[PDB]
Design a protein around this ligand. Structure first.
Ligand SMILES: [Cl-]
Ligand SMILES: [Cl-]
Ligand code: NA
Lengths: 25, 271
């Protein structure tokens, strides 16, 4: 609870949006 | 219980072949907390560590000029999560540090690109160092001091996203909390000033755009600096006005721990 968040979990959340749209199908 | 073990062994083997490595990284990253013995299992073979290090090496060409994709960032972050797992285990931490593994992450901390793939890559890289400082070990502090992590953190504290700023401040705080760490930063005016100037710029930004989480770590750093007599006399002159004002009084009415730390800071500064 010192940090209050998980840096790796937050990275996965933040990049999920970009991964779904960055490559033109 | 062997069905979980056999699946872990299979994925560890799959890291050797580059054709199966990507899926193996994803599956193993999901078990980084669920399986307590995961770190010595990974550390057992030089081949597993070489394969994880190869994933880091593969994205060094994506630095100059910045060309990292979210897909590239995400895959390398899965490998950084497995290394973080090795950095925080009591059986593997010393060996991880003796192998100088954090040095492979330093090129990612040096990047300045503000695109999400780079910012989230710095967040996860900071997270590995974060897990490592949390162990509360003298060997960790000595490593970070000699490898010049402080300037890397200060740059991120000044210009990174809110989350990256928090991890970087948290790393600095943990170094400051150690007696060797506080003495190192307060040894020269130059080192103290680098820290104090950045902390000051952060207070001014937090007064414009609040973040209680970031403020909690910023105040703790200042409070630890007050324990050194030379830093205390320097803070009597340079401490931001916003910390002596009613600026954060509204936000700190819900954060008792931080409000207490700020009170102890003003008390230490009033002699
Ligand atoms: Cl936490
Ligand atoms: Cl953020
Ligand atoms: Na010193």
């Amino acid at each position: 609870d010192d940090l209050g968040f998980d840096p790796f979990v937050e990275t996965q959340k933040g990049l999920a949006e970009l991964m779904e749209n960055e490559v033109v199908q | 219980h062997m069905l979980e073990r056999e699946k872990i062994y299979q994925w560890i083997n799959e890291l050797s072949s580059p054709e199966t490595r990507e899926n193996a990284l994803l599956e193993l990253s999901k078990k980084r907390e669920s399986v307590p013995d995961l770190a010595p299992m990974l550390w057992h073979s030089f081949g597993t560590i070489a394969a994880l290090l190869q994933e880091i090496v593969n994205i060094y060409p994506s630095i100059n000029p910045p060309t990292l994709t979210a897909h590239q960032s995400n895959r390398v972050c899965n490998a950084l999560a497995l290394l973080q797992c090795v950095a925080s285990h009591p059986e593997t931490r010393s060996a991880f540090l003796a192998a100088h593994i954090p040095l492979f992450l330093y090129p990612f901390l040096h990047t300045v690109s503000k695109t999400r793939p780079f910012e989230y890559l710095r967040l996860t890289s900071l997270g590995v160092i974060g897990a490592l400082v949390k162990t509360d070990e003298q060997e960790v502090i000595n490593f970070l001091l000699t490898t010049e992590i402080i300037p890397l953190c200060l740059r991120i504290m000044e210009s990174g996203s809110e989350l990256s700023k928090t991890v970087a401040t948290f790393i600095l705080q943990k170094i400051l909390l150690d007696d060797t760490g506080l003495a190192y930063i307060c040894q020269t005016y130059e080192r103290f000033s680098h820290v104090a100037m950045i902390l000051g710029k952060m207070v001014l930004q937090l007064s414009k755009e609040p973040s209680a989480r970031l403020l909690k770590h910023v105040v703790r750093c200042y409070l630890r600096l007050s324990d050194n007599p030379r830093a205390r006399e320097a803070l009597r002159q340079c401490l931001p006005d916003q910390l002596k004002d009613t600026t954060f009084a509204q936000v700190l009415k819900d954060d008792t721990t931080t409000k207490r730390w700020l009170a102890q800071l003003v008390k230490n500064l009033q002699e």
